[PDB]
Design a protein around this ligand. Structure first.
Ligand SMILES: CC(C)n1c2c(c3c1-c1c(Br)c(Br)c(Br)c(Br)c1C3=O)C(=O)CCC2
Ligand SMILES: [Cl-]
Ligand SMILES: [Cl-]
Length: 327
C-alpha cells in the first residue's frame, strides 16, 4: 500500500509519548489572566477572540474550545506542543481553563492578519514567491515532525502584509502520520481537498497538504480564488478533472486500486488534460513564469506520491529569487 516518500517512519522512531496524544496530560493555566477584547470568529468546535494578558499587556488570540471532545483537544494540544518553535507555525503561548467551569482554551500569539480576499488581488510576483516559500517552511517543519495539517487553505494562513509575517494556524484537524494507517477522508475544506479524499482513498500522507498548497499557488498566480470551485464534493472532483484530465484520473485510480463511487459516472464526462498556460491572460500574465508553471504542474498531480514534497518544492528554481534575497 501507499506510504509517504519522506518522514514515513519518523513517529515510530520517536518515543511513544510524542505521538500518543490520548495519553497526553496538558498543564492548564488560569484563563482569568486574559481579558477578551473582540470576537474574531467561530468554528465548528471553537470561538476565537482577540485578548490582552492583564499581567503583562501582551495581545494574544484565545481559542475557546467547545469542551466535549477530549481526545481531539489532547490531539491539538500535543501537536502544537510538538511543533513548538517551528518556523511559521503559530505559537501556542499557553493552555488555560476557566478556573470555575473548567472549559479549556488555547492562547496563541497575535498576528495582524490581512484579509486574504483583498490581499490576493494585489500580490506581486515576488510576494507570491515569498509567501509560498514561508508557508512551505511551515509545512516542511510539520511534516518533519510527523504531522499532517489536513486543512491548508487561505483562511488558515495568517499573513501580516505590513510586517511580512506568515503563520499557519488551526491545527484542530491535524494528525500524526503512521505508515499504512488509514485516515478519515472528511478533512480539509472542499476547494482544497486532494483527489485522494474525493475518491475515498484513506491511505494518504503529508502529500495531501501539498495538493492544498498547489491550489493556493494556482489561485495566487492565476487570480482565480478558489482555483477549483466545486459545488459539493462530487463536483469538486469534476472541477479537477476538467483541468488534469479524466483518462489521467483513471490511471491514478488504477495504480492504487481505488474504487470510484458510481455516482461519478454520471458527472465526470470526458476531459483532456489542459495546458497550464491556458489559464494565463492579461490580468495575471505578470504573475506567471515558466518556473511557476513547472512548480505548479508538479504539485497539482493526481498521484499523491508523485507530488513534490515541501522540501522539493522549496528547492525549485521558482524560489531562487527569494533564497537569494534571504542571503
Ligand atoms: C480567520 C479568523 C477569524 N480565525 C478563525 C479561526 C482562527 C482565526 C485566527 C486569527 Br484571525 C488569528 Br490572527 C489567530 Br493568531 C488565530 Br490562533 C486564529 C484562529 O485560530 C478559527 O479557528 C475558526 C474560525 C475563523
Ligand atoms: Cl483520521
Ligand atoms: Cl477550469
Amino acid at each position: 500500500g501507499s506510504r509517504a516518500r519522506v518522514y514515513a517512519e519518523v513517529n515510530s522512531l520517536r518515543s511513544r509519548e510524542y505521538w500518543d496524544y490520548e495519553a497526553h496530560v496538558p498543564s492548564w493555566g488560569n484563563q482569568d489572566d486574559y481579558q477578551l477584547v473582540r470576537k474574531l470568529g467561530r468554528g465548528k468546535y471553537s470561538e476565537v477572540f482577540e485578548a490582552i494578558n492583564i499581567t503583562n499587556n501582551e495581545r494574544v488570540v484565545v481559542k475557546i474550545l467547545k469542551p466535549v471532545k477530549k481526545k481531539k483537544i489532547k490531539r491539538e494540544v500535543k501537536i502544537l506542543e510538538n511543533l513548538r518553535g517551528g518556523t511559521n507555525i503559530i505559537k501556542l503561548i499557553d493552555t488555560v481553563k476557566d478556573p470555575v467551569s473548567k472549559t479549556p482554551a488555547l492562547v496563541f500569539e497575535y498576528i495582524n492578519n490581512t484579509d486574504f480576499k483583498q490581499l490576493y488581488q494585489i500580490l506581486t510576483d515576488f510576494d507570491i514567491r515569498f509567501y509560498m516559500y514561508e508557508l512551505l517552511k511551515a509545512l516542511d517543519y510539520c511534516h518533519s515532525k510527523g504531522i499532517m495539517h489536513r486543512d491548508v487553505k487561505p483562511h488558515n494562513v495568517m499573513i501580516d502584509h505590513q510586517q511580512k509575517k506568515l503563520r499557519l494556524i488551526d491545527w484542530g484537524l491535524a494528525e500524526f502520520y503512521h505508515p499504512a494507517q488509514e485516515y478519515n477522508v472528511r478533512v480539509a475544506s472542499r476547494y482544497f481537498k486532494g483527489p485522494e479524499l474525493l475518491v475515498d482513498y484513506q491511505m494518504y500522507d503529508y502529500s495531501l497538504d501539498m495538493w492544498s498548497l498547489g491550489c493556493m499557488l494556482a489561485s495566487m498566480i492565476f487570480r482565480r480564488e478558489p482555483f477549483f470551485h466545486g459545488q459539493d464534493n462530487y463536483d469538486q472532483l469534476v472541477r479537477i478533472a476538467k483541468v488534469l484530465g479524466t483518462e489521467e484520473l483513471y490511471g491514478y485510480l488504477k495504480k492504487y486500486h481505488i474504487d470510484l463511487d458510481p455516482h461519478f459516472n454520471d458527472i465526470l464526462g470526458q476531459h483532456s488534460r489542459k495546458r497550464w498556460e491556458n489559464f494565463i491572460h492579461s490580468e495575471n500574465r505578470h504573475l506567471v513564469s515558466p518556473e511557476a508553471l513547472d512548480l505548479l504542474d508538479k504539485l497539482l498531480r493526481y498521484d499523491h506520491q508523485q507530488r513534490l514534497t515541501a522540501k522539493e518544492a522549496m528547492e525549485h528554481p521558482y524560489f531562487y529569487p527569494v533564497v537569494k534575497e534571504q542571503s
